[PDB]
Structure formats: structure tokens, C-alpha cells
């Protein structure tokens, strides 16, 4: 027995009214497959004579261990795309424009404009609040070795008339000097001051000081000559004073120097002394004492004399020529 | 020849002992399978009449173009998750709340409390320094167009009487003022300086001042009549004293002007002008000049006059009174 | 009948120049598959009876459900790598390192050295720019309760002679004091002052002064006994002046105090009062006051005399006892 099985083309079976016998083979002679009767099903009805069916493969891939669209979908959510966040070098880059806490050197202006909580009262207000308790620099450190500037070092300014709190208050306790300004030897001379003041506020000075030393002057003022040559600061002065009109105005009335005593000294009101000597002065009850010969380019008004050293007046050089024209009228 | 084969249900021949022959095949009738002895094992332990193995398929997929779990889980490790990193915005919203070193607007407080590395000496200390040696601004520009304040624009305070530096120290070189304070023309009137002083150190001037000009003041002041009116400035002066006593005090010996030259000057002591001219003045020998009529309200003690234009003293007077009386009695 | 079908092993069929008719079975033994003959083909080049095609399977998996390795990459590399990218917490890391706007403490040197616009002028140059025109605070506030220090709380320094700007400038408008100082009264005393002024500068006073007071002195200079003792303040003044030599000078020609009216003054150029009562005054004229018993250790040069109470010179005195002399002389 050599077998051969009916067989046509698939696509002629597929429209064969040939029903095969329960496993009669009928074979698919262009595909080369075959499929077995069941008695009743056309050909194109029987399924092919052996397993197509994946759960019974043998060398099946790994497909539980494959990642799903979905599964990965939902893994990629949850990562931050490169476009939304900053790299660590960018990062860098942006934070190094930043002022350290610890420190750092500006390159431009800062400006405050305080929104003021209350801003508080005492050491600890301020928009700048520095507080050196601890430490042994200094606070506020300012200079400039430019050439020529277009601004001061500092400027405090206040606008409104009204405006009732200092510009710089300076409240010290210590052992050196509260306020210390050098203006140290000029090669190249200014003609200014180490400090220049002026007031137009005609109901209050424009300086007030107020000292209580014990042995000192509350101001003491020193004129040293600048230059070895004996005379060469002949018309200099430790105090000038200058008293002037408005400009276009009729004059004026000011007083040079004023002294008083509200509550009463017994000191020496005026003292002028030369090598610790006493010269010449006006004592607490407003009599003066000079020390050499004086001149007055007038009359001197004063009291009888009493004293031998006293300075006589007319009247008593004149009633003493009279008592002596009279008294020798002895010609009786 | 239509040939049928050996068959039964699947389940049927599983529990079947025919052995079928060599290549005789047997058919599953419910399934539709065949499969071909072996002439040893039953037929659940032969194998389909055709392959089963992945492997021999056609039309496989690209199974190994796909990403493995595995694979997949080791790539996305090595992303950042959106929630531990910050967005470009949100970094953007953190950084502009930081003070850039070009510059930018303070409106809360900065607050300095130095840790000190030793916070330097000179012109490299601070916890503020500035350095304007190449620029034509001005260093610290405080300002307040306000109407009233509670606090003052610049504060200085020191608070252990052992402190031993200044609370501002000013080192100028230069051809202006190295300070300059204006009070300008109030509209408002204050009752107070452009500078006010007070000290209650018994052991330390409340001001000291040196210079050494040479042909001026080393303190300059000058009085303007803030009015047109010639005599509007009456009861004004360039230089006020007042000498008080301690409240509940006893009193006071304080002096009111105290001159001296430590090393002996050759200038006048005291000079006072009116239109540059002469009118008073204490020469260094205490000697004294005035231009016109005085008057003293009581006696003045001199030495006996030699030249003519000398004052009478009264044992000068009486000496020559008696001389007359004598030398007239030559009643004789 | 049992059929049995012409059969070897594989390897042997491969190798077998056996022709299987159209639709023959052919079977190997070792592997139990079978294959039809199509009546040319050796059997190595038949294929099985059943199809071995994947699209063919049942049961198929969810290939298309799965994730690509290129798909995968592709969007991996739109996601941030960790080692890229700052977490959120090294993010406040850094950022907590920098000055909030809002304000915060420096704990190190704020350094400034501007590159420079202009740097302005006026009320928008600076720095450090402060407007305190809407707050009730302090601009700047540095203090120290530290007990000794190397360095001031605010230092200004220029160091070009050529400096065209002040180091402090102040501009007031207000109602109380510009600038206001307080030394006030130490435990353990300073031989120092409030402040202190040193110029060398030979061209311009160390202090200058204007004022436009009506009523007042353009200084007002007060002192207070620092004890309830009467005479305790015996050796104080309110002002004191020396006037010396350069070191190593020859001495010095300085005058003590001057005082002179530009334009002219009416008023008293210097008056001296105790308890508010003249005591001594020179008038503008130069002529002077006093109001009690004055000494001269000298003799006075002034005119004869023309009232009763004037001083009488000596030539009066002669005159008056010459003319007695003669008129007399009646001896006739």
C-alpha cells in the first residue's frame, strides 16, 4: 500500500461540497497541509490535523519578561523631562550670581527701600543693622583712592522741614574720641576744612556744644605755627570771628563774643595768658587786670581816686589846685 | 481506498492501552489532532504528527526588538523622578527671591553679625566695605524725603565705657571740605543746630580742635544778619558762652575764655576789629590798646606817670600839690 | 486495515533520493513528524502537513501591547538624568546659602567695588542706596557692646590730595538737631573728647562755621561744673585756646583771637556778663567798659582831659601847677 489521500487545491476545497468520513485525510496539494473529517463540516470548516495553538509551542520567548507600552508609559510619568528642569550646571551658573550669606563682592548697586514692619527703635532697626559685639573689625568701611570723584564718600540728605530725627546720631560710650577727623598734611593744598558747617536756621545755632570738665576747656582750640619760621604765621589766629550783612541788606547788629554766667561764676570770665603767664583778664565781678602799659586813643571816665596808686581825675586835680589857690590867699 | 483511522476522544485515548504501530496514526475525534505510534507508548505520550517549536515557525515577531523589564527598570533608575527635583519655574521663583551681586532691591532688613576671621585693619576690613577707587560714585547715599520718622538716617552706638576706638573716624585727603554738614534755610522753623555736642566727661574736652593755617583761623566763625534789617540781629553773636553749675549744685569757678601760648607767642592775644580796623587789643606782652573813651566804674590802680601823656596817679598829684606848698612858703 | 507509511529517520530521509507521490505520507521515526509528497520534491524540501505559520497560532500574545527598545529609547532621552540634575533637597541646600531679598544675616564681609554706569548723582548714586521716604526706621545702624576693638564702627578714608568730594556729606532739612553727638557720662573716664579735629592743612581753617541766627550765637558753647562743689571746676573754661610752635620751630607770631566785622557791625564786639549783668564790654567804636576797680602794673597813655570825671594826664596835672606857680607869683 502506497496511500494517496483526495486532494485539490485549498482554494478548491474552500468551495467543495465534499464531506469527508470521520478522520479521512484530505489534503491541501498547493499548501501541502492536511485536515481530517468529522463526518459533517465542508473542508474549509476542519482545522488542520495537528495543534496551532500557543500555549502549546515548545521554545516559547520570555513574554512575561517584556515591558508593556502601558507599564513603561506610566514609569516615564513619573520622571522629570530634561526640558523642565535645570541641569547642575545651569544650576551653578544661576546660584553664582547670588550673594553668599558668607560673603561676597557686589559689582553693582544695592538699593534699599524698606516695606517696615515697624522697622523698630534702638540697635535693632535699621535697614542695615550691624552689630559688632562680638567681633573686632569695624562696621561701615568706605574709602576711595580715586583722583577726582563725582560723589562723597557718604550722604545722608533729608527733605521735609517737618522731618523730626537726626541725619547721624552718634551715641558713645569709651576711651578714645567719639568722632575723630584727620585732614593730614596736604602736598597739593585745599582751601577748605577738615569740617565746614553752615546754617541758615535763624532761631537756633549752628552749632551747640555743651561740656562739663573739670580742668579743661569744653572747646579746646590749638593753633600750631605750620612752618619753623618764627613769624611766618603772623596773621593767623586760634578764633576768628566775622560778623556780616545779609547780601543787599542795611547791616548789622551781631555781637563778636558773648559771655554770661546764667548761674554766676566766680571764675575769671576772660583769661589771656602768655607762657602760662597771666597777661591781662577780667575777673568774675567784671574789674580788669593788665600787665603793662596801656593806651586809650580817648578819655578814661572813672571814680575819685582814694588810693595813692589810684588814677586821679580832673575833678581831683582841680579841687586840689583850688584848695591850694585858696588856702594860700593869705595876703590878709 | 478511503482510509479511516484508529480513533476516539482525546480524553479517550489517554487512558487508552493501545499501542499503536509505527507511523499508524491515530485520530483525536474531538480535537481533530492526529498523532503516529512509536510501537511503544501510548498514545498521550506521542507526540503531534507535526511540529510544535517556537522555533520552526515563519512569521515570527521581533521578539528581541522588544524592551525587557529588566532592561527597561536599570535605564529609567538612572532618570530623576519629578517629585525629587524642582522645575525650571520653581527654580526660577526661588532665585529671583535672592540678591543678585550686579544688584538688586532690598525691602527687608540686612542684618550683619560678623563671625570674624579677624575682620582685617585698614582698607580691607568691614563687615560693609566699600571701595570707590576706580568709580565717580558716591559710597553710601542715605535719604529720607518722609515727613517724620521714628529714627534717625545714620545711627553710631557704642556701649562699654572700656571701648577703645572711635565711633566714626574720618581720614581725608583731598581739596574740599572732608565734612560738610548744610542746614539750610528752614521754612519750618527748628530750635536746633546743624551740629550738637554734649559731653559729660570731666576728663576729656567735649570738643577738641588743632590747625595750623597760616594765615587764618583754625576755627572760623561768621555770623550773617539773617534779615535786611540793620539791627534785626541785636541780641545775636558769632561766639555764645554760658558758665553753669551742676543742678543742685553749689555753684561754679569755671572761666569763660581761657587764652594761652604753651611756647610764647609774638602776636596779639586778643584783637578785635570793626572794618578792619583796630579797635581793641591785648598785645602779647598783656599790654593793652582801645581806640576811644572808657569808662571804668570805680578806681584804677597805676604806676606814678614819667611822660606827659601818662595818667595822673594821686600820690603824683598830692606830691605835687605839697611841693607847691612848700617851695610858695617863703613867707620867710 | 492498518496503515503503515514508508518512514526513517529524519537525518536519513535528508539524505534519501526518494520521491513521494502527491499527497504520500512520509514519516519520521525519530521525530514523529510527518510530511506529504507533491511528487517532485525530495523530502527534505516538503514541508509538514500543518501549518507552522505564527499568524496561523491561537492563543496569540499581546505583541503589539509591548514596548520597543526603540520606542523605550526614544522616550527615555527626553527624561533628566540624576547625576544631571539637583534634587530638591541639594536645591534648598544651596539656595539657603543666599540672601534673601526679603532680608537675612551676612555673616561674612559684604565687599562692594562697582563696576560703575555712572554710578549716578544725588538720591539714586551709591552703593548702597537707601530711601527711607515711606518708613519709620533707621537707615543705617552700627553698634558694638564688644569691650575693646581694632577697628571703628565707621571709617571713611580718601587718599588723593587731588580728591574733588567730602568723605561725609550732610544736606538737612528737619526740626531737631542734623548731626547730634552724646558722650555721655563715664564710669571709667577718657581723656578724650567727643569730638576731635586735627588739620595740617596750612591753606584753610580746620573748622569752619557760618550761621544766620536772630537772636542766638552762631556757637553756643556751654559748660557745666561735673560736681555739686562750687570751686570744684576752679582750672575749667568754657573755651580754651593755645597757640605753639612747630617742632623743632624757631615759635610762632599766631594771634589768639580775632575778631572783626567785614561790613560792619553796631553791636558790641565783645561782651562779658555775669549772672546776666554787663560786666566788661568793648563797644563797636573799640572804646571799652568795666565795671569795677582795674589795674594796670604800667602807666596809661591817654588824652587830657575835658570832664571832671576823666582821667588827668600828667601834662594836665603840670599845667595846672605851673599856671598856680606863675599866677602866684604876686611877689609885686
Wanted: charged share 25%; net charge positive; glycine share 8%.
Amino acid at each position: 500500500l502506497r496511500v494517496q489521500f483526495k486532494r485539490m487545491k485549498a482554494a478548491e476545497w474552500a468551495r467543495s461540497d465534499v464531506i469527508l468520513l470521520e478522520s479521512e485525510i484530505g489534503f491541501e496539494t498547493d499548501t501541502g497541509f492536511a485536515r481530517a473529517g468529522d463526518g459533517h463540516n465542508r473542508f474549509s470548516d476542519l482545522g488542520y490535523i495537528s495543534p496551532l495553538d500557543y500555549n502549546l509551542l515548545t521554545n516559547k520567548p520570555n513574554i512575561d519578561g517584556l515591558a508593556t507600552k502601558v507599564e513603561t508609559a506610566q514609569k516615564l510619568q513619573q520622571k522629570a523631562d530634561k526640558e523642565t528642569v535645570y541641569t547642575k550646571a545651569e544650576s551653578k551658573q544661576e546660584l553664582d550670581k547670588k550673594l553668599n550669606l558668607k560673603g561676597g563682592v557686589m559689582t553693582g548697586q544695592l538699593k534699599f527701600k524698606p516695606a517696615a514692619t515697624v522697622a523698630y527703635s534702638s540697635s535693632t532697626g535699621g535697614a542695615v543693622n550691624i552689630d559688632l559685639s562680638s567681633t573686632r573689625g569695624a562696621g561701615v568701611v568706605v574709602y576711595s583712592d580715586n583722583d577726582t570723584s563725582d560723589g562723597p564718600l557718604m550722604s545722608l540728605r533729608t527733605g521735609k522741614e517737618t522731618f523730626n530725627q537726626s541725619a547721624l546720631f552718634v551715641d558713645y560710650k569709651g576711651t578714645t574720641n567719639a568722632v575723630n577727623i584727620a585732614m593730614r598734611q596736604p602736598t597739593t593744598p585745599n582751601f577748605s576744612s577738615a569740617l565746614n558747617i553752615t546754617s541758615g536756621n535763624e532761631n537756633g545755632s549752628a552749632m551747640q556744644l555743651r561740656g562739663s570738665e573739670k580742668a579743661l576747656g569744653t572747646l579746646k582750640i590749638t593753633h600750631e605755627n605750620p612752618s619753623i619760621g618764627a613769624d611766618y604765621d603772623k596773621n593767623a589766629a586760634a578764633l576768628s570771628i566775622d560778623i556780616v550783612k545779609k547780601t543787599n541788606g542795611a547791616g548789622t547788629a551781631a555781637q563778636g563774643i558773648y559771655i554770661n554766667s546764667t548761674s554766676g561764676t566766680t571764675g575769671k570770665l576772660l583769661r589771656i595768658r602768655n607762657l602760662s603767664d597771666d597777661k591781662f583778664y577780667v575777673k568774675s565781678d567784671g574789674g580788669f587786670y593788665a600787665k603793662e602799659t596801656s593806651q586809650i586813643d580817648g578819655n578814661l571816665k572813672l571814680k575819685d581816686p582814694t588810693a595813692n596808686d589810684h588814677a586821679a581825675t580832673k575833678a581831683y586835680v582841680d579841687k586840689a589846685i583850688s584848695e591850694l589857690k585858696k588856702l594860700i590867699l593869705k595876703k590878709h
